[PDB]
Amino acid sequence: WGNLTCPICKGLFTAINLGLKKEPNVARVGSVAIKLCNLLKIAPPAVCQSIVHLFEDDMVEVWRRSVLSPSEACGLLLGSTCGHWDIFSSWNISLPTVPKPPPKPPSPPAPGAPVSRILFLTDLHWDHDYLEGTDPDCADPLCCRRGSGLPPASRPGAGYWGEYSKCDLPLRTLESLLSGLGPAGPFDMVYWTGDIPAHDVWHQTRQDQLRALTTVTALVRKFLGPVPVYPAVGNHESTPVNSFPPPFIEGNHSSRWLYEAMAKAWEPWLPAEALRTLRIGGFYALSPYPGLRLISLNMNFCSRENFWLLINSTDPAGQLQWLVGELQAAEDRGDKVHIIGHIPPGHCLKSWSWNYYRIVARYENTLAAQFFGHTHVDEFEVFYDEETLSRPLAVAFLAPSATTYIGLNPGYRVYQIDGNYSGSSHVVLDHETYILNLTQANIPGAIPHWQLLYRARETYGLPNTLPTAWHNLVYRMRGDMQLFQTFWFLYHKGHPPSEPCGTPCRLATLCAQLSARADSPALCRHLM
Ligand SMILES: *[C@@H]1O[C@H](CO)[C@@H](O[C@@H]2O[C@H](CO)[C@@H](O)[C@H](O)[C@H]2NC(C)=O)[C@H](O)[C@H]1NC(C)=O
Ligand SMILES: *[C@@H]1O[C@H](CO)[C@@H](O[C@@H]2O[C@H](CO)[C@@H](O)[C@H](O)[C@H]2NC(C)=O)[C@H](O)[C@H]1NC(C)=O
Ligand SMILES: *[C@@H]1O[C@H](CO)[C@@H](O)[C@H](O)[C@H]1NC(C)=O
Ligand SMILES: *[C@@H]1O[C@H](CO)[C@@H](O)[C@H](O)[C@H]1NC(C)=O
Numbered sequence: 001w002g003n004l005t006c007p008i009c010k011g012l013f014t015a016i017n018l019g020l021k022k023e024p025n026v027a028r029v030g031s032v033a034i035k036l037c038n039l040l041k042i043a044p045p046a047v048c049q050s051i052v053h054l055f056e057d058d059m060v061e062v063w064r065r066s067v068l069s070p071s072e073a074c075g076l077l078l079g080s081t082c083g084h085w086d087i088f089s090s091w092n093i094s095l096p097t098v099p100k101p102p103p104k105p106p107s108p109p110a111p112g113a114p115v116s117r118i119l120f121l122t123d124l125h126w127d128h129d130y131l132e133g134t135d136p137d138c139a140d141p142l143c144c145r146r147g148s149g150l151p152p153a154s155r156p157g158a159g160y161w162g163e164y165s166k167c168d169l170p171l172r173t174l175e176s177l178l179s180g181l182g183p184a185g186p187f188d189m190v191y192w193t194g195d196i197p198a199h200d201v202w203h204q205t206r207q208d209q210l211r212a213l214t215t216v217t218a219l220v221r222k223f224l225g226p227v228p229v230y231p232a233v234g235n236h237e238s239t240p241v242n243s244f245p246p247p248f249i250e251g252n253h254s255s256r257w258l259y260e261a262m263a264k265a266w267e268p269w270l271p272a273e274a275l276r277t278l279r280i281g282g283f284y285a286l287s288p289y290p291g292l293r294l295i296s297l298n299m300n301f302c303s304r305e306n307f308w309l310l311i312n313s314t315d316p317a318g319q320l321q322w323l324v325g326e327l328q329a330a331e332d333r334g335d336k337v338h339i340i341g342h343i344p345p346g347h348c349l350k351s352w353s354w355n356y357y358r359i360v361a362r363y364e365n366t367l368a369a370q371f372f373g374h375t376h377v378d379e380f381e382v383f384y385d386e387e388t389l390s391r392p393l394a395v396a397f398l399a400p401s402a403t404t405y406i407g408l409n410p411g412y413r414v415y416q417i418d419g420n421y422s423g424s425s426h427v428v429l430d431h432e433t434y435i436l437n438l439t440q441a442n443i444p445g446a447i448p449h450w451q452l453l454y455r456a457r458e459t460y461g462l463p464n465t466l467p468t469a470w471h472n473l474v475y476r477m478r479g480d481m482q483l484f485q486t487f488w489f490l491y492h493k494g495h496p497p498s499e500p501c502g503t504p505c506r507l508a509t510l511c512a513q514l515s516a517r518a519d520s521p522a523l524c525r526h527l528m
């Protein structure tokens with residue numbers, strides 16, 4: 001008989017579940033997994049072993065509770081009649097029934113108006129074990145560190161301040177960055193959008209991550225003193241990397257250890273109501289100025305690499321619904337909003353990104369600026385209206401990384417923003433990027449000099465940095481190879497790759513600038 005397949009299917013996966021709770025079976029999962037890691041030469045055997053032992057516990061639990069959960073698996077295999085497969089299913093948040101007011105671009109600031117200067121720091125990736133002179137091109141995923149061994153005598157080891165390879169930054173190079181901020185300042189606030197630990201992801205204890213948090217935190221408080229700093233949660237803060245279980249998972253394997261430690265390390269910067277949200281799901285809002293709301297989002301809940309979302313991808317932590325509430329409240333008060341976060345919205349899971357896109361379109365008048373990092377390169381994302389995908393209505397600045405990883409100059413970013421006064425638009429007016437030219441900083445017996453790399457309005461001839469100016473820049477760059485090469489140069493913080501970026505490469509790079517929503521090829525219909 002056939003009437004027995006559904007009972008048998010569930011019986012199988014219920015026992016599947018119970019089998020995978022026993023630690024010696026988890027180890028057995030790891031043992032074969034390490035041997036396959038070695039057969040496909042994914043990495044040196046030592047890291048294969050480390051990374052699987054680190055990942056196996058959380059990973060087997062996630063699979064047990066999702067793909068192999070009887071309701072899901074028998075849904076996939078046997079159809080809606082037996083269970084219900086809903087892994088990464090589509091979902092929608094609710095916009096309030098308040099009418100969307102008429103679209104209104106920001107007013108040009110009056111002459112002599114207050115300008116707010118914001119320092120933007122992202123992707124610091126301090127590698128505690130960075131070791132000068134070690135091999136920059138080792139067989140591991142991160143080199144120039146303890147255990148990378150020595151290079152051949154034909155090439156030189158890692159520069160004292162960094163290296164142009166898959167290498168991160170020694171703490172002293174981070175110290176130099178903060179020490180040299182004087183010329184670029186003074187600053188009204190700092191936005192600090194994540195990635196404190198290095199890319200040593202095969203051996204990262206909770207203590208290694210907290211030391212990184214605690215150490216780098218203390219360093220910026222030492223150099224910025226009274227200047228408020230607003231962090232956002234990066235994907236490398238936790239362990240395993242990208243492992244951010246949503247608050248519906250409680251216990252030791254939750255993110256309590258990370259968010260609680262952040263709340264105590266960041267107490268001097270964030271108010272009390274904000275520390276509440278931070279402890280729950282690593283996001284928060286506060287008011288830097290009267291008339292301005294800042295919202296710090298945790299992009300790991302949108303992230304394609306957060307394997308916990310296999311259990312439930314629907315608006316994790318209710319963060320998007322919470323964001324709607326705050327934006328409406330801001331609209332009701334006539335406030336403007338800054339959003340900061342780590343992973344840029346265009347790189348999120350499809351459903352999350354589409355709801356965020358819709359949220360941005362709805363509150364285009366209230367959102368004044370958007371800031372992300374994570375990509376380590378200097379770029380941006382343009383938002384358009386939902387109705388026609390052709391009227392530019394927002395832009396996200398993707399600031400480049402402090403880390404070299406990979407092959408880049410260290411860099412950081414400063415914004416001029418319509419300042420602190422009643423009626424301010426609070427939009428970005430211009431920005432500047434500073435870099436450390438490693439080819440001359442690494443000269444023996446040299447003292448690093450952080451130099452201004454460029455100023456946005458000056459080099460791109462922009463009349464402002466409103467969304468329409470950046471839309472225009474992308475389409476200008478489509479037809480002006482010299483201008484695109486400038487963008488390509490700055491994209492890599494002054495150290496572009498040797499291989500020329502030709503026609504296909506250019507189109508893909510330009511396309512990325514317009515793709516603020518994931519899996520939406522239509523946004524690039526005018527390029528290809
Ligand atoms: C919570 O779970 C973590 C694993 O994620 C446990 O951490 C390990 O503790 C041993 C004990 O010496 C260390 O050798 C490992 O390196 C630790 N792993 C990590 C990733 O930090 C931790 O002990 C657990 N805590 C409780 C209270 O159960
Ligand atoms: C994943 O969690 C979300 C909520 O975070 C669940 O969506 C809820 O489902 C219940 C039961 O039908 C409803 O009463 C709630 O109103 C829903 N909330 C939202 C925001 O949609 C979802 O069902 C969960 N998925 C799984 C597989 O457990
Ligand atoms: C969400 O809205 C879209 C319309 O864009 C619709 O296709 C989808 O079925 C909706 N999902 C839910 C759960 O309402
Ligand atoms: C960095 O310095 C080297 C050495 O003088 C120079 O060739 C290169 O053009 C410089 N690049 C930048 C972006 O400063």
Ligand SMILES: [Zn+2]
Nearest residue numbers: 195234235374
């Ligand atoms: Zn990142």
Ligand SMILES: [Zn+2]
Nearest residue numbers: 123195374376
């Ligand atoms: Zn990074």
